[PDB]
Design a protein around this ligand. Sequence first.
Ligand SMILES: CC(C)CCC[C@@H](C)[C@H]1CC[C@H]2[C@@H]3CC=C4C[C@@H](O)CC[C@]4(C)[C@H]3CC[C@]12C
Ligand SMILES: CC(C)CCC[C@@H](C)[C@H]1CC[C@H]2[C@@H]3CC=C4C[C@@H](O)CC[C@]4(C)[C@H]3CC[C@]12C
Lengths: 37, 37, 160, 160, 39, 29, 39, 29
Amino acid sequence: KYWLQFFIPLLVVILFAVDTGLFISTQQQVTFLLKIK
Amino acid sequence: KYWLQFFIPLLVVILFAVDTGLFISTQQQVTFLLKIK
Amino acid sequence: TWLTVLKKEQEFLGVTQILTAMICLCFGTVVCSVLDISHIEGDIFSSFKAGYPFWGAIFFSISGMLSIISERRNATYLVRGSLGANTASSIAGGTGITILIINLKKSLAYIHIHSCQKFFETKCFMASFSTEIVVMMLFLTILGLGSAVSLTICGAGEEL
Amino acid sequence: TWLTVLKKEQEFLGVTQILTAMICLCFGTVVCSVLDISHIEGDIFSSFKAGYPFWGAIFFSISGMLSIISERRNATYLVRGSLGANTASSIAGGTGITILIINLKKSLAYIHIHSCQKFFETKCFMASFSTEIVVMMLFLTILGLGSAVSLTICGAGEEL
Amino acid sequence: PQLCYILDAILFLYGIVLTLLYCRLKIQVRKAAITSYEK
Amino acid sequence: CYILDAILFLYGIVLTLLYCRLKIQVRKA
Amino acid sequence: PQLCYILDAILFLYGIVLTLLYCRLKIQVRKAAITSYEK
Amino acid sequence: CYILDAILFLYGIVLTLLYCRLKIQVRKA
Ligand SMILES: CC(C)CCC[C@@H](C)[C@H]1CC[C@H]2[C@@H]3CC=C4C[C@@H](O)CC[C@]4(C)[C@H]3CC[C@]12C
Ligand SMILES: CC(C)CCC[C@@H](C)[C@H]1CC[C@H]2[C@@H]3CC=C4C[C@@H](O)CC[C@]4(C)[C@H]3CC[C@]12C
């Protein structure tokens, strides 16, 4: 009824969570990439 | 108050979501691993 | 030189397409779940009443998935299907943009006059909430449609 | 040959330690936020009232972090800190097990005698809920404590 | 005769087992990749 | 509730199946 | 002038921009890796 | 509510700075 102004932070927090998951994934990916001589 | 029996699914759904994320990341890593001659 | 650079970058537009498709479903679900649409006194819900996110999410998801798989897998019949899905998504977006424009047109008039003085949380907070949601929807739909038209024009790049 | 297998298989113990620490916070915050923990007629909460969810939350976490970083970076002073963190976590788990056991004892004393015939949904649903939650926490803490003790005995493997 | 969460109790064990098994598998495959990529 | 539990009760089956496929694939590797 | 939501909208836009750009870099680095390790 | 945005606001700042570091160290390599 009045708590409607709460879902927008709920969306952005999970967006940032999956975003940082992708970030650490690509971090590990580039760490593997730089293992080059 | 009486709706307490709802948090147990709430934690397990994100647990399984992060498990699927780990699966896709490790599948991506293993596919890269496999291509060696 | 535009053709070559657009050919090099194909599936990232598919990534933003699938992100759009996944995100547009949430607004529809929450709007249809928290409160019913058939008894809105202000009649603000017009785009949501027609189920536009339901119309567009499937088309955008198909377009993005097909674009991603085309780069991932070079199937013979998938190339034409990707172009067809891109055209269908382009037409769907072209209709939805007009739908949201008329929705904002019918929504601003109520708020402007005599309904809610200044900002919300006086008598008409839910309409301001819906207005913010639909403005975000319109902006994100423009962002998706730009990538959609770019992918559509890039995909053909050849006679038939 | 036990020492070699334990040494080579180390960071997964840190993974389960940090999983225990992370999952402890969610339960602790939800239980201590949904309702006050000092006005229970049965005084069911005998663990959350004693800080246990927040007693070994940033306590298992630091041990897991040290264990994970140990094989990643072999610092000069980190190896000494890891053993101390592991043994302190072992002691904390040993205290948590007995406080959780007495919590089960009191919850069963409550539900056992005349408080609620058959299962819940009569007067004390929260009693059964708390009992189940604390049983789950006890099992997960046993799983964490076993790994903690295994890492503690593995880490030394040498004089001092 | 009072199901739902009684049957939903074992599912948490399921989740814990899977979320630990994936972590063990990922660490093992990372170790194998490191040991195979060195030479 | 019960159906909500059912919807997440077969997720485990597919998750374990793909886990086993990954296991056999890495064993082949 | 009511605060919060006006400042919240720019945060939302920032979130989508950041996640989209990180995805772009993820595909970019994947192509870089596949083009580097192929030879 | 008013303070809720504060916690997540510097989250974006730290992610942007760490992205800058990642970009500089991928351009180095
Ligand atoms: C809107 C709220 C309610 C839910 C949001 C879910 C979103 C964030 C989910 C749904 C689909 C997901 C995307 C699916 C595909 C890709 C492409 C991949 O290369 C990177 C991850 C990425 C980009 C995912 C990011 C997270 C994602 C966009
Ligand atoms: C219960 C919900 C709310 C939160 C759960 C948080 C847990 C599951 C998350 C948070 C941080 C995560 C860990 C972060 C770091 C690593 C190291 C990596 O090499 C393996 C995965 C692992 C071990 C992750 C496992 C899952 C993890 C422990």
